[PDB]
């Protein structure tokens, strides 16, 4: 059962659901709109070997970034062309990890689902690989998984990137995400690599 | 809380939920099956600069279309080969936008989620980039975002392309999608480009 | 309305929901964790013509598999290099179909949604094309649709690959998935090709 506008405000006011920073104009009919943080991570190894710690680079943009589909085959000359033509701070290819500005906390009876805005979907830019359910009890910013699938897309710092949809659990969870000792991503504060090698 | 077959029929009968055109055999255990319209849009610029109006081409198929994965690198000679070999009206590469035949209206206490049929998913053809939640209050056909991820796929006009799953809001929304002055896509009547440059 | 840990255990104990094999440590706040079976299917035709029976190959891994993004353009020499360097049993490109170890049965008032683990999503490995709703009444293992979108990824037999999220229907379905004569995928026992050509 999905929380509507006035439910979102109710839960936020009482601090049953935390959203920092919260803004009321981002509340929609049944979702909260989230915004693109300025920090990205790009991975650096030949293959993802999930049993190893993964090497990465971080970037912090000032205004904007060009995300290219994989196998756009970026040369230095191409990167430079795009930078001059479109005034973007960085050009990247394939997968890039980002983060929401909003930090969120969920009680043990609410579960959230992250999805990308349909305006982005309509330019074939996804900000999540999977269905996007955050666990009851979760604390942290949300890590985005950004891939473009048709042509390069310019994203701007702080733009609305997607939305959270909150729903009621049938019963509250005994252990929220934050409480579970094994939880990898509790208290996220920026964009954060995969830790699957802690499974 | 998800509407089952008999709930879908109930809401439709009373016109609490509109689905034009409605067909009872498309009602399944907990979803309504939707069909592929004949109109597509393909985008035409080098990059998606979300702050500009985007250039596009429209196509209207008679029977079928071949959707290729990106970087299938289509030459005229290849397009011709596929057209002769498979009798398709058009061959396209990467992202293509489509539309459902069904126009839908949602009340302020129902939210819908569009997903693609698992038979298509099993040939690596997606018809949505994001998680697919339509807002409570929405009016319009649904724009599909079609990408193939393994090999080219033939889609036929009017085939069942995916499904709507409807769920109850905890409380009705104060402003439905259609009522909000800023809503971009209310009353959709075909496939429709992205308007993110109106954010 | 989403089932929490203790709801999952309740439904399982009474055999309202079947999960074979069931393991209690895989129960999380509001989901059940599922594991990667050892059998995959790779498709073999130039294009997916949904009105034909599709040709495929099957593979059974001993330990692990390297999934490459499409257009990694795999030569025999490259396949051999990856096999020696990473000790994987198979190297594949683009889409590959897999299966969960868990066989599941759903009653007519519960619907499940499959999603991939966020740890995989963070390495741009998806295990489903579409939103992932299983119908009320469904019986079978779950077929995965695996694609990597940034760099090749090593998956291991029996690893946790994703999760099921279960929710309550507003009303029970008159016909569960298993009961419907037209249902394609009831009683799945491994990974299974697409049957869309039975529509
Ligand atoms: Mg990358
Ligand atoms: Mg919106
Ligand atoms: Mg998923
Ligand atoms: Mg998704
Ligand atoms: Mg295209
Ligand atoms: Mg079906
Ligand atoms: Mg999404
Ligand atoms: Mg999706
Ligand atoms: Mg393949
Ligand atoms: Mg988890
Ligand atoms: Mg879908
Ligand atoms: Mg999805």
From Swiss-Prot, chains A, B, C:
Keyword set includes Hydrolase: yes
The UniProt record lists the keyword Nucleotide-binding: yes
Description of how activity is regulated: Inhibited by dTTP.
One of the GO BP terms on file: dUTP biosynthetic process
GO molecular function, one term: dCTP deaminase activity
Active site, renumbered: 145 (proton donor/acceptor)
Protein name, entry field: dCTP deaminase, dUMP-forming
Organism, scientific name: Methanocaldococcus jannaschii (strain ATCC 43067 / DSM 2661 / JAL-1 / JCM 10045 / NBRC 100440) (Methanococcus jannaschii)
């Amino acid at each position: 059962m999905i929380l509507s506008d006035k439910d979102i405000i109710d839960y936020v006011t009482s601090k049953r659901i935390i959203i920092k920073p919260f803004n009321k104009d981002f509340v929609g009919p049944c979702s909260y709109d989230v915004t693109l943080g300025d920090e990205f991570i790009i991975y650096d190894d030949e293959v993802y070997d999930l049993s190893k710690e993964l090497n990465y680079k971080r970037i912090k943009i000032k205004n904007s970034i060009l995300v290219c589909p994989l196998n756009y085959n970026l040369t230095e000359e191409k990167i430079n062309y795009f930078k001059e033509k479109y005034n973007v701070d960085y050009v990247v290819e394939g997968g890039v990890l980002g983060t929401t500005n909003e930090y969120i906390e969920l009680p043990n009876d609410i579960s959230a689902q992250y999805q990308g805005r349909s305006s982005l979907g309509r330019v074939f830019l996804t900000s999540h690989q999977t269905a996007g359910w955050i666990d009851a009890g979760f604390k942290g910013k949300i890590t985005l998984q950004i891939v473009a699938f048709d042509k390069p897309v310019i994203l701007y710092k702080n733009q609305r990137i997607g939305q959270l949809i909150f729903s009621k659990l049938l019963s509250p969870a005994d252990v929220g995400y934050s409480e579970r000792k094994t939880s990898k991503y509790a208290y996220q504060k920026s964009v954060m690599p995969s830790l699957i090698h802690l499974d």
